[PDB]
Amino acid sequence: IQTQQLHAAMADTFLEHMCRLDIDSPPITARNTGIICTIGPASRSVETLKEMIKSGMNVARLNFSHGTHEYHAETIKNVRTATESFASDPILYRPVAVALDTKGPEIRTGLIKEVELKLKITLDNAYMEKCDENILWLDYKNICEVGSKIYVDDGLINGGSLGSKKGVNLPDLPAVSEKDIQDLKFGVEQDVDMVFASFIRKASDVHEVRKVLGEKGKNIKIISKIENHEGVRRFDEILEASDGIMVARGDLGIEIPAEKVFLAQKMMIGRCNRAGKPVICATQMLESMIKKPRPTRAEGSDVANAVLDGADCIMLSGETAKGDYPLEAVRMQHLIAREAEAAIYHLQLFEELRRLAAITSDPTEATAVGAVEASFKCCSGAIIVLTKSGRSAHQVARYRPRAPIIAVTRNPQTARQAHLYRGIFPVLCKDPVQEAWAEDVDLRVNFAMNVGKARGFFKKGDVVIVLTGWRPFTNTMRVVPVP
Amino acid sequence: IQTQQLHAAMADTFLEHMCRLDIDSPPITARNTGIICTIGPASRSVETLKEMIKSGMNVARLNFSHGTHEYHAETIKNVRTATESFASDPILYRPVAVALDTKGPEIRTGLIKGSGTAEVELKKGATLKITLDNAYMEKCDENILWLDYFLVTEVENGGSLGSKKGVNLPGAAVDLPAVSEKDIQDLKFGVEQDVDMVFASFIRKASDVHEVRKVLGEKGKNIKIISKIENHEGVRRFDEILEASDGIMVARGDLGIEIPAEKVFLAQKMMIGRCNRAGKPVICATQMLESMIKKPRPTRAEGSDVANAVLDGADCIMLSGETAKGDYPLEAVRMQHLIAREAEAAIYHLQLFEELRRLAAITSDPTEATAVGAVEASFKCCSGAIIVLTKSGRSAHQVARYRPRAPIIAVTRNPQTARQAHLYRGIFPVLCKDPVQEAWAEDVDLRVNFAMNVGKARGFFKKGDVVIVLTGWRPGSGFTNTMRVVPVP
Amino acid sequence: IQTQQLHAAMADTFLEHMCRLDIDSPPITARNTGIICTIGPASRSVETLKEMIKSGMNVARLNFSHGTHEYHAETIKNVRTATESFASDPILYRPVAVALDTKGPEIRTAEVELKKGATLKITDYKNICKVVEVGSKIYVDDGLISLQLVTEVENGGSKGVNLPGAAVDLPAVSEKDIQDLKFGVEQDVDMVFASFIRKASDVHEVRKVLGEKGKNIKIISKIENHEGVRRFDEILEASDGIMVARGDLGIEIPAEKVFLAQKMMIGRCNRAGKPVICATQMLESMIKKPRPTRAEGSDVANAVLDGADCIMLSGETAKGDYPLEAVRMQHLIAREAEAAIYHLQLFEELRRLAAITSDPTEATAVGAVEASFKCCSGAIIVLTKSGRSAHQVARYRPRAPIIAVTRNPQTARQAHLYRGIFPVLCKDPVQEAWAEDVDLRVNFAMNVGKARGFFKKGDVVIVLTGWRPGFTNTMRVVPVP
Amino acid sequence: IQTQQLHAAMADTFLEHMCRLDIDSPPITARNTGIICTIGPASRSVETLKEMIKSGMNVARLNFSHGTHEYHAETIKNVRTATESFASDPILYRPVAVALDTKGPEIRTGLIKTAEVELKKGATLKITLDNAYMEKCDENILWLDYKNICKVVEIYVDDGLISLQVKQDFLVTEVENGGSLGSKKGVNLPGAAVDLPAVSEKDIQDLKFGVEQDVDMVFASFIRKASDVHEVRKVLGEKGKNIKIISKIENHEGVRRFDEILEASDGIMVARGDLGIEIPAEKVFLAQKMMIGRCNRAGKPVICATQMLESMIKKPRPTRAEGSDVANAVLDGADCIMLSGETAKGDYPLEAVRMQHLIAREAEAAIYHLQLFEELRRLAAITSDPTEATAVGAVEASFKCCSGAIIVLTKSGRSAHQVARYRPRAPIIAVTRNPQTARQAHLYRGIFPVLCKDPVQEAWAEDVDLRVNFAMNVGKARGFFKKGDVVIVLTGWRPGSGFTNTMRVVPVP
């Protein structure tokens, strides 16, 4: 009571659960929702990236709609330089994933040399870098009603600021282009952790991305970005082929009526939760913070409601890439997400996730849901999960516990990819593998304990749930008290 | 199926309800959420007000934080002039409420260069002198700014500085009066102008609500008092404030500065839930479509904000600068209309009705049992409307508290009742002007047929559809005891 | 809250609902579960039948497995003589239905002593060897003797025959079934209990016998064997109602499984809104004792909690020594169990399982039931000609009694099949003014309810009528005058 | 879906759950509801008791309302002789508990002269307190043993078969119901405030005798208040501090004071016989469902007793009402069901035990576990006790994989008790080296106790595995599960009680 919105947590109805929400009930220290940040001129710097990690960044998203492979290579180097500067203290080290966002079948403008419009759309490539208030270039070859309205820069253009390489939307380009082929091949070379595939329209599109990543990138998680009507209508087949989903609201809000976007968002988040696959809510969550240090009330509400919807990650696309207040934007998402995680009606969520879950003979699945139930019974400070591939941690997150899921791994890629799942706080263990299997299992558990104690996830008198295996397929649950 | 998100309506779980939301499931024609629009330079004209009414406006909010009584009088005149221009056709006539928003215990600025519409661009790091000398009351600019509560400050972030703007001192315990002398005058002016409701700013306690009611006196005893919760004290004392008030406004603008911005959604959802639980109107207000002040399309967060407020259970949604001073007031009104309809169809009515009854007390009031019976019957047959004859509005309010999917066509001869009905989700008020028939049954039928004709013309239903009709057995207020499931004639 | 277990009614969980059941919370006067009594030598007299009506009897069951048409004709005469002796006072008159229980496709055989392990050679069912295989079981005399045609005595001892699991091909209607059924049409019975219904085609054959003259006679299919349970859905769709004939069912299927079939059929009938009867041995010990056993009290109560519209008495009233007490016991327990129903969950699930239809009568009925819960109504008064409007209300299982007012005597008698319908037969002439005819019939329900103690002046009741001088679509929440 | 009523288990509503119950859906082999049998002339023999164990008996109930200490001692000897004759095979051995049922504050009549008299309806009977007629009870005069009788009355004899209506050191009544009046029959004064002691001198004598004979539990008759339970515990003292005290709720006061009685007791018995005389018979089902619900809510054992299969005293098959009564008691949530005359004096004791076993198994599959487990959690308190979190986590896991068993290592039984309170579908195989723990476990729904007799292994971890494999072998032999199935295994991290914190989801070896 008076903490973690626990009074609201015990209500017999969702209506009373709302009525008991208390701004004076402080949340726990731990924050479950992963934060993805688009890197750009305002945040490419190593000094900024270090502070962005401390502010809550978990995934660095690189939009390959602009920039050369050389440019992104230096960005990744800076990201990894900032990340590895905390490796001197493995208790406080934070794994940071690198995400590749494809250009996709996008129609883009050219370079300004931005300008304020209060316009001849050329297709001659001599203006492919000479665009401005009067000139503007376009890249769609198979282009040609008289053509009434053309939406530029996420439908912004009415006058405004027209930047370089802005987007154009027409509510037959290939799913993956050769330029796309290159970027993922480059992403495989740079050992990125995940791929954000733009404008995925069908399941065949997802299979093409996987073939390109091939055996070399077989562990690269493919997150399909639903940005248009076709993606929504074929969502089920896209989700089955993908490792996760991004609700790309920017383009989606242009391709489909703006008043329907919340329907598509809640549909995809629900189905991803139902499938136990990660879902990302993206774009314009804190749009005004590009120029202002404080978000609007609608922006604060959007982030909170995305977490309440069940989103695994929330994104900043330009608030961190080019805005004037990148650190504040990340901190705001951290603050809002933590408050919203406490406001989740876990009583109903856990019940429906279980009732919608299949009866299986898999010991790990039964063990994971048992750990989540136990963590509710004792209001656990954490669920510690030992995992090599991440699956054990993913299975716990799918049942959406209140307590944070501390995944201990020796696999760095597994550690970085874990950010895709709500509640997984990955820790990279660096102690040598013990020759005795039980002692190596135990060794990683004490590692998770020390991180949780140091970060303030739990204290003396709390209780934690520990998930391990029994043979050299995690099937062992231990309820141990925190010293 | 395939319509009004009815596939999502039949889900056994809220998770499956989310999974079944369909962007290709078109909503019904009727829109249940009331729309309140702040009137200002962008919307004072009769021509604009005419288009704002057609675009979906139900309540006109006049902020007395700025402007003279003379100025506001012409605003009310224009609102009523635009409203009465549709009175030549009572089938499509739309009652429009007038709302008075008090200044309250506000720290406000003054006129930029002697003009309310004038603005200045402040730059980061600039120096600004805050003055209390009334020689700058009407002469504020990028260098000097007068206030009604001198200080040399810097600009931690610049922007457009307009006239009669707000100032906030978080974390403190201000000593400004709940009702000021200026508030008393504005409140008396509102009683004289026959406004329908008062939005009382910065209500911190129940004593505040009672003082506003005393000023409204006997002449304004029927003026609805909506307490604006804008600060820490208002949230902590919400139950006693709600008990004293006729309704509640989540005034997120000031609330988002007074309390941490990341906590505002908690206070919003708490208050909407408690008003829903109490059956009193609740308004979600401010910055819902802020970007539409300068842009013709809202941001994705703003579209989400309106939808979720409706899903939260808000009776009304508000527009401030988007309609008072923005460049796209009609589009902002139309955007709220479009989103509200979509979100109204996405409500999980199965669970909502379920909790509303269980949280409702067993009463011997025949009107209450009749209202909840009408809502159940409207769910059973997916009725096109619940027609309610009401004199004071009470009968219609009791139906709205149980949140039916179908629109509530409240028929009244009382114009003030017609205007105030906009405060409740789903009440579509129609002002009947026909003479009272001496035979009660024929007077009842006359008003029922009036709602029928409105519903047909509006595309709510057609002949052969099924509607729920709530009437009384004796003329007057308090005898609503008859529920009929009738085919449209 | 101290009455009708209303404290238990407000529990948020069924477990807490159980925890709040209070032996000191008295039930209401009205009793909702219909009571069906088999009439026989112990209850045939006019004087006894009068006391049985006063004690709660709603339906008189005549088992045509025994007795001649002459005998049953005199039984019906006595039932109607006792019933009609209260007709001089329509406030205290109780419509009493007459039910014909068919012999059906029955297999029949001093005494002889059978020994365990001995062999028996079977030599009136001429087609048994084609429906039983080597190793099949045969049960004789209410399951007393069991055999395994060269049979082996599995259970010995010193009549009716059951072939469990076996697909018996005997005709649905026998020649004497046709004659008995035709006799029932001649005697103007209200309902038929069709024994050993195995498939939907069986129900259609019974309906064929009743013809146009008995087109309004309700057919209650008796589920008595494995095939009937396995084909229940098609049987229920074809029938007007269902009887859980536990006597024979307990022989045809393992006795430990009978409760599964009972709760299955009651649930499915509740889901369809069709009457269901729980029958046989409910108070069996009261044949010889004036008080029931604890198991028998529990059986009656749990049948009501299951959702059965009626409970039945067989030997307890046909041949036992305490028929009045057996009827009174069922009346008392049913009332206690009706107050112990978790109406919060029941009403919730009945609506969710109900289809969204554009039928005004359906919307009116569920709206009336919802309103009756909101104001703790003393009754739901329904004016009805066919009973349909009253049946639609009963399917949503309100706590309050449903006073169905009708001028149709058959409608009044058949209404007893539905939980909660208290039928009253209005006999006043139709008034030329429509509204005065409605008011006359509503005030009749008013006076009946007041006299029976269902409510008093100033209480609140729900009234269901029509709006123009042909379908019930008007609900009024009125104080009792 | 075709077994254990699993289709009905997945219904979104209890109504649909009813609609999906399938007589062709066979239950699992395991039977969770404990069976208590009253021992008497029909069942005292070692040979009969042997068959009673094989037919399903878990608890032998000895009614000390009759019989000498010598008599009951020989019954206990036969029970243990019959029980230990299966110890030659520890895989199939079944621990059998011995339960002492007290006489309590009982009012009994005098002696007639198998002599009995026929009381006739409408006739008159005089109640006398004069000890001269203590062995001269006839059709007109009847003696009893209650000192302050005529004061607390302004009457029911022989289990309520005979009912009297008083008309006046004496009393004049009129026979409301006739029947046969034997010697030392029982008398009920419904509602009247009886001042008889909770524990009598005879009760103290029997209770001390039970400690000497090492009984596992006491069925305390006519518990009216918590002070009564406390008096029973005082008599049992430190020597019998581990004897479970089961309070029998048989009267109005016990129901009204149930919460305080339940708090003081180890369990509760719904003694429907006397309760059905003390309160109106039509209300007994209310008191049954209240007490079972509250015992389920408190996590303490509850027994449904008396007349469950009454007709089987003379008949080899039960009535349809009796079969329903057994099933519905299990559906209510009763941990154990009881037989009284059906096994003590009836002609078909074996069949009565077999029928209860059969019905209970069928009813256990028909429980709506979705709603039951859900409410048990919501009504359960958030605690920092690791054993509590481990228990509810294991049960949740057991539903997820439809486990063949939940194997629990326990010395005192507590770990196994905490699992049973959440009512899993799967049986709880409690492995113990404590024979008293094995016998007392029968009080809890679903706990199948197995008494391990292997020597303690020198390596503690190997001793744990030995006991887990023992449970595996028991489950294999009883047909609870087979190789390749999945079971939940509950153990501790340290030796000794109170360290059960480890849940393993393992395939059967």
Ligand SMILES: O=P(O)(O)OC[C@H]1O[C@](O)(COP(=O)(O)O)[C@@H](O)[C@@H]1O
């Ligand atoms: O239920 P109880 O009495 O707490 O017994 C459980 C104990 O059994 C064990 O699982 C092992 O048994 P032992 O203590 O006999 O070695 C302990 O770890 C555990 O604490």
Ligand SMILES: O=C([O-])C(=O)[O-]
């Ligand atoms: O590409 C995106 O992220 C979008 O359109 O939102």
Ligand SMILES: O=C([O-])C(=O)[O-]
């Ligand atoms: O007054 C208001 O609307 C606010 O402060 O948001």
Ligand SMILES: O=C([O-])C(=O)[O-]
């Ligand atoms: O025929 C019957 O009623 C039976 O078998 O129960």
Ligand SMILES: O=C([O-])C(=O)[O-]
């Ligand atoms: O004593 C008993 O067991 C009873 O009364 O049932």
Ligand SMILES: [Mg+2]
């Ligand atoms: Mg995009």
Ligand SMILES: [Mg+2]
């Ligand atoms: Mg204001």
Ligand SMILES: [Mg+2]
């Ligand atoms: Mg304000």
Ligand SMILES: [Mg+2]
């Ligand atoms: Mg028959």
Ligand SMILES: [Mg+2]
């Ligand atoms: Mg007839």
Ligand SMILES: [Mg+2]
């Ligand atoms: Mg039969």
Ligand SMILES: [Mg+2]
């Ligand atoms: Mg005893």
Ligand SMILES: [Mg+2]
């Ligand atoms: Mg007692």
Ligand SMILES: [Mg+2]
């Ligand atoms: Mg007793």
